[PDB]
Write a protein that binds this ligand. Structure first.
Ligand SMILES: [Cl-]
Ligand SMILES: [Cl-]
Lengths: 269, 269
C-alpha cells in the first residue's frame, strides 16, 4: 500500500563490506527502503531514480557527477555534499570552522593551538619544536582520509618527529589524563565511547550541543569527533579531530540508528 | 582601421582613485583599449560587451555575477577568478600552495613554520608561545584584505601579543637582517623593492622562477609577495606573505606595465 524509497550508495568495496550488512539491508527494506548500490563504472545520471544518495568517494570525476546530480535534482538529499566534506581536508580550516561555534553550560569547549611545518629544513631547524612537550599528535596538513598515511599519529620523541613528512600539523598531547572520547554522530543522534589513548564521561547535554553545532557548521550528517577533558581544571573539553562517515558498523545497534536516519532524510521538509 | 577592445573594471572607489589614472586610461586608449567602469548598482550580464574583466571586489553577490559571466562567456578572461583569489584568504592554505612549487639554482626557497591560535584562553595558556623569539608577525587566520585589521602586524613583546584577536597565525621574524623584498608581479613581468622592515638584492633569475611558480600555482596574474633572505646562510629566501592586486600605482612606469599586460590578455591564445 505505502510507497517505497530508494537509498543509492556509492562506497568503496571495504566500506561496503563493513557498513552494508545483511542486518542493515533487511531492516531498511522491512521499513520500505531499498539500499541499491551505484555502478562506479557508469555515470550517475544514467542510474535509476534515487530518493537519497549516501557516498564516501573522492576525486574530480565523482565530485563532477555529484554537482551535475545536485543541479538536475535539487530535492534529493546527498549525504554528504562534496564541498561540506572538503571542509575536513585541511586540519587548520577544519578547526577554523569549529572555532566559529557559539558556546553561549558549566562545561567549556576549546580548540588546541597548532604548529604547521611546511618543509624538511624547518623540521630540523625550527627552534620552537625544541620547547614542545611530547607526546605530540601529528597529521599531514591536507589529507582526505583515503591514503593510510593521512591519519593522526603519536610522536614520543624528537627522533620520531624528524622522520615524518611535511607539511604537517603538530599539537601537544599531554593534558588529557590518558582518556579520549570518540563521539559518533548520525544526523540529530549522538553516541559516545571512552577510549584509552597511548595504546569519567562528559555531561550528555554538553556533547549534544557540540554535535549540534559541528553538524550545522560543517553541514555533515555523518561524522565522528575525538574530544579530551583538560584535567588541569576538569570541566574544559577540547575537540582534537573530526572524520567523515566513520566506521559505524563497530557500534552495536548501528543498523537501527542508520535506518531511522535514512527514514528522517527521505521525509526532508 | 584595427578593432578596439573593452577592459571592464569593477573596483572600489579608493582603488579606482589610485589605479585608474588619466595616464593609464590615455595610454590604453592610444593602443586601442577602452577602460570602462562596471555599474556596481546593475547586474554584470546587463552590462556592455567586454573583452577583459579586471576586478577587486569580494562578496557572495559579486562572486555569483562572475560565476554566471564565466559560464555565459568562457573565452573572456577574468583577472582574477574569485576561486583563485580565495586561495589567499587562509594564511595556512596560501602557504600550503607555495609549498607545492618545485625548486628543481644556487639560491634556496623555504616557507616559515607557523603557530595557529584559535581562542583567548590559548593566547594566555599556550606554553609554546613563551619560547618564541620576538618580534613576531601576526595575521588573522582567515582575512580577505578588506577590513584594515586583516593585515600583517609586528608584535614586540608578550603584552602586545595578548591584546590581539584570535584565530591568528604567528611567525618568528628574526632571521631577515632587517630587510624585506616586496616583489610586484603583473602576468609574466616582475619588479622588486628593497624595504627596511621594523619601521643586497636576490638574483633576478631566481625571483623570476619564484614569480613564475606562484603565478601557475595560485592562478593569479596580479599579486605581490614579500620575501626575506635567511642571513644565517645568506643564499636562502623565504616567502612570508602574498597579496592580490596590490597598489601598483606607487611603482613609477606602472601604466606601461599594465597596458602591455591588458594587451597580452586580450590576445589570449
Ligand atoms: Cl562501517
Ligand atoms: Cl593602485
Amino acid at each position: 500500500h505505502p510507497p517505497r524509497y530508494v537509498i543509492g550508495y556509492a562506497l568503496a568495496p571495504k566500506k561496503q563490506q563493513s557498513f552494508i550488512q545483511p542486518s542493515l539491508v533487511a531492516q531498511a527494506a522491512s521499513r520500505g527502503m531499498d539500499l541499491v548500490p551505484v555502478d562506479a563504472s557508469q555515470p550517475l545520471a544514467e542510474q535509476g531514480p534515487f530518493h537519497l544518495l549516501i557516498h564516501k568517494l573522492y576525486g574530480d570525476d565523482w565530485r563532477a557527477q555529484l554537482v551535475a546530480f545536485a543541479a538536475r535534482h535539487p530535492a534529493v538529499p546527498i549525504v554528504d555534499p562534496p564541498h561540506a566534506i572538503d571542509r575536513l581536508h585541511n586540519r587548520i580550516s577544519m578547526l577554523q570552522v569549529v572555532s566559529e561555534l557559539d558556546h553561549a553550560q558549566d562545561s567549556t569547549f576549546g580548540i588546541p593551538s597548532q604548529v604547521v611545518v611546511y618543509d624538511a629544513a624547518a623540521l630540523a631547524d625550527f627552534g620552537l619544536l625544541a620547547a614542545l612537550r611530547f607526546p605530540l599528535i601529528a597529521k599531514p596538513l591536507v589529507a582526505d582520509g583515503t591514503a593510510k598515511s593521512h591519519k593522526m599519529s603519536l610522536v614520543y620523541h624528537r627522533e620520531g618527529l624528524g622522520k615524518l613528512r611535511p607539511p604537517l600539523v603538530l599539537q601537544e598531547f599531554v593534558n588529557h589524563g590518558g582518556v579520549i572520547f570518540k563521539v559518533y554522530v548520525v544526523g540529530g543522534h549522538v553516541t559516545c565511547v571512552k577510549r584509552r589513548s597511548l595504546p569519567v564521561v562528559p555531561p550528555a547535554a554538553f556533547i549534544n550541543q557540540i554535535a549540534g553545532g559541528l553538524r550545522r557548521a560543517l553541514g555533515l550528517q555523518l561524522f565522528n569527533f575525538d574530544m579530551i577533558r583538560d584535567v588541569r581544571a576538569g570541566d574544559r573539553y577540547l575537540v582534537i579531530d573530526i572524520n567523515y562517515f566513520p566506521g559505524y558498523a563497530k557500534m552495536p545497534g548501528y543498523e537501527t540508528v542508520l535506518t531511522d536516519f535514512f527514514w528522517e532524510m527521505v521525509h526532508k521538509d
